[PDB]
Amino acid sequence: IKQKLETQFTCLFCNHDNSVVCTLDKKNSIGLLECKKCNLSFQAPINSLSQPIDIYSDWIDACE
């Protein structure tokens, strides 16, 4: 079953903190970051061990 989790991470674009939601689909190995504010979306691959800090880390490197 998918996991819809709220986090305390700051969006890299709109800068609103505590407004990034992480949807981790392990059945297809696809993780999804969403803002609740500006609502920018970012997709990245996840394994079985990943957690909201794993894809949010991949989002920091995808920008820089």
| Binding residues for another protein (CB under 8 A) | 8-10, 47, 49, 51, 53-54, 56-57, 60-61, 64
- Is residue 35 part of an annotated ligand binding site? yes
Spatial distance between the Cα atoms of 55 and 46, rounded to a whole number of angstroms: 7
Q: Which residues contact 33 (CB under 8 A, 6 or more apart)?
A: 20, 21, 22, 23, 41, 42, 43, 44, 55, 56, 59
- Is residue 14 part of an annotated ligand binding site? yes
- Among 30, 32, 40, 44, the residue binding Zn ion under the rule CB under 5 A is 40
- Among 7, 14, 21, 51, the residue binding Zn ion under the rule CB under 5 A is 14
Residue 38 sits in the site that holds Zn ion (CB under 5 A) = yes
